Amino acid sequence: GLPTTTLPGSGQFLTTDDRQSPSALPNYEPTPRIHIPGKVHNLLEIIQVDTLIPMNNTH
Amino acid sequence: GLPTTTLPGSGQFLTTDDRQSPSALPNYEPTPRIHIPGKVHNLLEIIQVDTLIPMNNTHTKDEVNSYLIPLNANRQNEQVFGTNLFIGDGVFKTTLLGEIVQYYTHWSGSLRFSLMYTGPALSSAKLILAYTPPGARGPQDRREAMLGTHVVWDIGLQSTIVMTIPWTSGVQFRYTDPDTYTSAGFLSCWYQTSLILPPETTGQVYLLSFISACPDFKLRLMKDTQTISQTVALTE
Amino acid sequence: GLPTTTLPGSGQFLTTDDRQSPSALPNYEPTPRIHIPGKVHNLLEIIQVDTLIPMNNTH
Amino acid sequence: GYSDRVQQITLGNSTITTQEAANAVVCYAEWPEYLPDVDASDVNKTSKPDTSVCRFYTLDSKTWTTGSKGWCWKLPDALKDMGVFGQNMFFHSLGRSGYTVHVQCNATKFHSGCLLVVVIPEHQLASHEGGNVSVKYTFTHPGERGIDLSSANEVGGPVKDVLYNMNGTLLGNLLIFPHQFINLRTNNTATIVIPYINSVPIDSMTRHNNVSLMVIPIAPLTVPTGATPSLPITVTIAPMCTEFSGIRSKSIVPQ
Amino acid sequence: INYYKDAASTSSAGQSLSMDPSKFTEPVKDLMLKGAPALN
Amino acid sequence: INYYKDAASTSSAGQSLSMDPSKFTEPVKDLMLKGAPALN
Amino acid sequence: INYYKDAASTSSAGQSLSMDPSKFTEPVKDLMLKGAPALN
Amino acid sequence: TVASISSGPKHTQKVPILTANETGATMPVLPSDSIETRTTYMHFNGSETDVECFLGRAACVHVTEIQNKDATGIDNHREAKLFNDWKINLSSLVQLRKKLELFTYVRFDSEYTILATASQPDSANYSSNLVVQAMYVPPGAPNPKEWDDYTWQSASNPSVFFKVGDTSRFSVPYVGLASAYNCFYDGYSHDDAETQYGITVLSHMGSMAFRIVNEHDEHKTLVKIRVYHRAKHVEAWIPRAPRALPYTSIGRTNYPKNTEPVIKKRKGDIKSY
Amino acid sequence: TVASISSGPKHTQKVPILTANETGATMPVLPSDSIETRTTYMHFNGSETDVECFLGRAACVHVTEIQNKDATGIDNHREAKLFNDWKINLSSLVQLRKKLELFTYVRFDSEYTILATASQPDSANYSSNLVVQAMYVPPGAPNPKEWDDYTWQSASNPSVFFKVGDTSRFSVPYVGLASAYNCFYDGYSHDDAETQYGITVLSHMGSMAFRIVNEHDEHKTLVKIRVYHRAKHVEAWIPRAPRALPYTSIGRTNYPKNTEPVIKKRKGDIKSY
Amino acid sequence: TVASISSGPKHTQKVPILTANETGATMPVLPSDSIETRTTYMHFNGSETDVECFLGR
Ligand SMILES: Cc1cc(CCCCCCCOc2ccc(C3=N[C@@H](C)CO3)cc2)on1
Numbered sequence A, C: 001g002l003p004t005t006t007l008p009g010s011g012q013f014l015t016t017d018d019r020q021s022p023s024a025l026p027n028y029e030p031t032p033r034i035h036i037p038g039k040v041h042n043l044l045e046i047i048q049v050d051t052l053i054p055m056n057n058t059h
Numbered sequence B: 001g002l003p004t005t006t007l008p009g010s011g012q013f014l015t016t017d018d019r020q021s022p023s024a025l026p027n028y029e030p031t032p033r034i035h036i037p038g039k040v041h042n043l044l045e046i047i048q049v050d051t052l053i054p055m056n057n058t059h060t061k062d063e064v065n066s067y068l069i070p071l072n073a074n075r076q077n078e079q080v081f082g083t084n085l086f087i088g089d090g091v092f093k094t095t096l097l098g099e100i101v102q103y104y105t106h107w108s109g110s111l112r113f114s115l116m117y118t119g120p121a122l123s124s125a126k127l128i129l130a131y132t133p134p135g136a137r138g139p140q141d142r143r144e145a146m147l148g149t150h151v152v153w154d155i156g157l158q159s160t161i162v163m164t165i166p167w168t169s170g171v172q173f174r175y176t177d178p179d180t181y182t183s184a185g186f187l188s189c190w191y192q193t194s195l196i197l198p199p200e201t202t203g204q205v206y207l208l209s210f211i212s213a214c215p216d217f218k219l220r221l222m223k224d225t226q227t228i229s230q231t232v233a234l235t236e
Numbered sequence D: 001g002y003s004d005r006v007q008q009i010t011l012g013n014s015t016i017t018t019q020e021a022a023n024a025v026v027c028y029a030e031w032p033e034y035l036p037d038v039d040a041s042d043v044n045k046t047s048k049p050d051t052s053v054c055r056f057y058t059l060d061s062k063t064w065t066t067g068s069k070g071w072c073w074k075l076p077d078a079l080k081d082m083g084v085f086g087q088n089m090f091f092h093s094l095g096r097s098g099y100t101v102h103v104q105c106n107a108t109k110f111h112s113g114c115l116l117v118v119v120i121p122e123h124q125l126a127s128h129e130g131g132n133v134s135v136k137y138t139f140t141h142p143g144e145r146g147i148d149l150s151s152a153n154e155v156g157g158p159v160k161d162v163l164y165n166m167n168g169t170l171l172g173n174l175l176i177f178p179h180q181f182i183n184l185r186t187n188n189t190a191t192i193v194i195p196y197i198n199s200v201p202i203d204s205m206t207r208h209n210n211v212s213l214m215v216i217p218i219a220p221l222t223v224p225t226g227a228t229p230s231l232p233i234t235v236t237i238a239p240m241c242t243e244f245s246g247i248r249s250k251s252i253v254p255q
Numbered sequence E, F, G: 001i002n003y004y005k006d007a008a009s010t011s012s013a014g015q016s017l018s019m020d021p022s023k024f025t026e027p028v029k030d031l032m033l034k035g036a037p038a039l040n
Numbered sequence H, I: 001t002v003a004s005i006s007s008g009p010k011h012t013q014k015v016p017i018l019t020a021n022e023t024g025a026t027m028p029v030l031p032s033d034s035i036e037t038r039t040t041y042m043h044f045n046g047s048e049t050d051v052e053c054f055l056g057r058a059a060c061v062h063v064t065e066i067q068n069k070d071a072t073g074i075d076n077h078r079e080a081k082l083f084n085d086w087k088i089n090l091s092s093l094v095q096l097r098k099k100l101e102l103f104t105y106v107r108f109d110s111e112y113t114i115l116a117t118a119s120q121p122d123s124a125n126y127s128s129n130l131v132v133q134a135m136y137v138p139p140g141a142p143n144p145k146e147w148d149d150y151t152w153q154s155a156s157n158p159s160v161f162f163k164v165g166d167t168s169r170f171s172v173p174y175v176g177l178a179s180a181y182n183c184f185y186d187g188y189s190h191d192d193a194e195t196q197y198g199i200t201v202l203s204h205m206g207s208m209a210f211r212i213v214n215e216h217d218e219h220k221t222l223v224k225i226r227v228y229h230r231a232k233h234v235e236a237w238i239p240r241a242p243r244a245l246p247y248t249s250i251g252r253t254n255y256p257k258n259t260e261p262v263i264k265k266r267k268g269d270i271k272s273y
Numbered sequence J: 001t002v003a004s005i006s007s008g009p010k011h012t013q014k015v016p017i018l019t020a021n022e023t024g025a026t027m028p029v030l031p032s033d034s035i036e037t038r039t040t041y042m043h044f045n046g047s048e049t050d051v052e053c054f055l056g057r
């Protein structure tokens, strides 16, 4: 038995933390990926495509 | 599953502990630093800059005048000012030195006390500043004063005189907060000869006095300052 | 997140255990030691000095 | 035969000579310099009028009398109307600058008096009303006139109490800011070089002042017998390494 | 260190650091050079 | 050992051990030597 | 393994294993040999 | 390191103790320039005066309170403390404030600890464990209207759920818009004739919203939230004079009128000890 | 290691058993100087008599008590135990005191454990988990006046928050002003004719303040605090005679008048067994 | 990485700002194609806009 101390924050759930978890479906094999045109990696990729501005807002 | 045991103290929150925490904002990129003159790294850097001491504390409401130590022409043998050296209280207390010392419990080191003369250029004066180490009373006359640490100051072209209160102590640390056992002495100043004004001139002349710490100085065991408090939370 | 199990005795306070603790005064510098004659290391050092026995206990 | 005492500063088309100086202070030991690329953000090339803006402007003179409490000027405000410096100021969106400040006050070897000349980076003033009353714009933009600490409280203006630096701190501790004394017996001028100090690389010159220059009598003026009881104090200031960026239409500011 | 056997149980992935907007911003068949005329 | 990915999540920094009061105590333009006259 | 930065936070010290009673049991100025007469 | 060197009698033309303070310098004079000293060592590093250490311990920055009670018929949850909210700020409480305002610009990461304790004022029964939810609602994002709005879904906004009686802890990077946070700002948000003066305009960092996730039991439960803040990775520029008068407002320098003399008057003369 | 060597008959001019105790020495005489012995080994190191071991286990040094109750209309929180305070000291309880005073000067780091248990004397309902706050109020720093003063912000003063029923543990470096703590001090704080004598004047180490963070429930709750202290990294100088009479005061050597004979009288003669 | 390069006056036959949006492209025009710029660096990677980050809380 190794001695430990727990710190403030133990047991909290922070929606933004990133840790490991047990898989509920041990050993399951996902469907293979096939190729699909159009993959997005960054939202910065798409905000460089121009779109129309409803400038004439007066309606 | 690795076997563990939790010790006493688990779950406590100690405001002074230093550990890692998850970031709430994963992957966020802070603004770049640009250069800004003036970076401070240690409070020890700043307590070496001297600031004015309201030595003339005798007023009744805070005034620019309690920074001015007056001098009288033609007095001989007499005493210009006196103070004990409780740097955390009394005259010292509002100075930057006094103000920082109050964030710590213990101090040790030498102090630098200087006086800048502001009288007409055609006047002259010789003063004696004396440091009295712990153990004797505040000196009562120059004879008594002159037997301890002292500097005869001759007022000249060079306007300021820097007296050092060298660390004289049995115990290597003293409390900031007024302790007896831990007390540091007295500082007094007397006419060595006397102030003399030129013709066509009259009245009082004043000395400005500063305090800063020597590079010698140590402060330790941080705590809360008696210099600030509040009764309800502030709002916008 | 590494999986753990806590054993019997968790949370107990044993006045005789010897472990690490956080310092309440982070970074504080203690007064230097100076030399003092007389250091004791073991109680076995001192019980070899003889002392008087109130043998005449009859008072 | 160089003395700490005599000095000449030539900047642009203007020169100052002092024969009774007491060295010069360079804030935080740094000398004004232009904005490096590594620190840049705005993509605009900046404009550096050089000698037409980096010369010495002498503000109107003040009069130290035995009752004076002290005066306060803000930068770049104090210069908002000086020559082309000022025009550039109202015409660009952003600008940046360092300064040489030269405060002048001469008397004779029978006078006494001592002024503190100090530069305070980000001097946020307090309302004399207390609470959370704000200090209106006009009040913190006195222009070349500066603020006269012995003038009366006004409404929407700052507090003018000297033992508190106009902000809740004691006069005695102003010495932690770059400063120099003018002690009639020693000194006759004070000179401070101010590098640009901000938390952003360049800023607006009209909505934010980045230093207040403060001249405060501390040992009262004492003139020789039957002398006139007052001396003028003059402040001359020169922008140095000025850069303007984001030119356009020309700001319109309150009052 | 993964403590678990399955890949789904590992933490979040790490930045694509891929980034290529041209499939979205310039899907034209004949290449357009900036500075050259759009329509020749 | 950092257990977390972001730098903000690490513990306190470690002593500057920088320390140079001269920007505050001696910001004069012409260097003053202790022992030499202040004003020449 | 120390988990903490300060020395006060470490566990108990480890045995002096110093042990020298002579400062207490034989602080005499001229050395006494067992077996030789106490007072000569 | 030597704290003092050995120095003996002096009869020179070289006087280190005469200076001209008008210059603005504090000449580095030592005991050995004016008395005869002996060698002594420092034995000390100045570790605990590092600014990281000075600003690096948790300070209480905010105490708020919310209650768990039947919201049935409450027209204004916010007003019933069915979920309070706090306009994040770091000058509401003063112990830490005076410490930070010793500097003009400050840059650091924050570590927050949130302690939540419950109180049952009106004589009660069984208290079912309440779980608090603390959301970060930065400026531009919907702010909660009822204690159970869509807002609380918080799909893009970091939120932590912990139990009353426990503590929550997480750390946020330096979120300032500029290179440092301004402790002071002598400016306006624009050249308006009536806009507010100060940093209030620079302090925008949004607010943080707390609520209990639990529905109501038969009694009412008061939960009081205390937020602690610890600076880590500190960087501070341009020291200033310490605060002397009391504070009146978050973000302005203003002091109260008819305040009291802050310098202690002597009981005696200038000459007194 | 041999505990005894083998030694046989002796008929010498060299007598190790005759000495002169007037000299102040304890001559190192052994069984083998006066009887015939056989070899035997020690099999032992003297591990558990090391001073680190002797002073190194936790001892109870203080029991105090505070209560959680409605402070409404209390004119003196301190007096209602709305928050007690303890003048840190290490001689209030005697088991550990006699152990330390076997030495004149002692130097060590302290590890504190604080156990807090709750009691509900007046028949009650549901007890909501109380959280205790333990502040270190060194001398020179504002000492708490109400149970919820600005003091408790403790922005610069180390404080720990733990739950009643649990334990808190942290360790403080050796905070003495000198090189060691004086277990005894035959001096005064100054040459005053009426100043106190003893160490009380050297013991200054300030006090430690406890309070409950929780507001009040309908019943009252008594929380009793026990502070345990363990010396780690011990260094002790100059052994002294053990304490024989009972103690009367923290910090003075004084014993009670008409105390009882401390040496057990024989039931019989000097000659008795 | 540079966010903007330095660029000065232009008087060309090569106009990067005239395009034909009918083509469906968004031509990659920059500040330096139409005003005079100074060098500046990005100081930023676009970390927190990665889709793993966007959908990962
Ligand atoms: C769940 C959850 C909750 C949160 C909160 C995120 C932290 C955001 C707060 C950012 C730091 O806030 C400030 C505010 C003011 C100042 C400041 N004002 C001046 C006096 C000085 O500094 C500094 C930081 O994150 N996740």
Ligand SMILES: Cc1cc(CCCCCCCOc2ccc(C3=N[C@@H](C)CO3)cc2)on1
Pocket (backbone or CB within 6 Å): C024, I088, I089, I090, I091, I100, I106, I110, I134, I135, I136, I158, I159, I160, I170, I172, I175, I181, I182, I183, I203, I205, I208
């Ligand atoms: C939270 C929190 C609470 C604390 C307390 C800090 C510990 C300070 C106490 C320092 C050690 O106190 C003493 C007092 C007396 C003696 C002593 N007196 C003589 C008989 C011998 O030793 C030694 C240590 O720290 N963080």
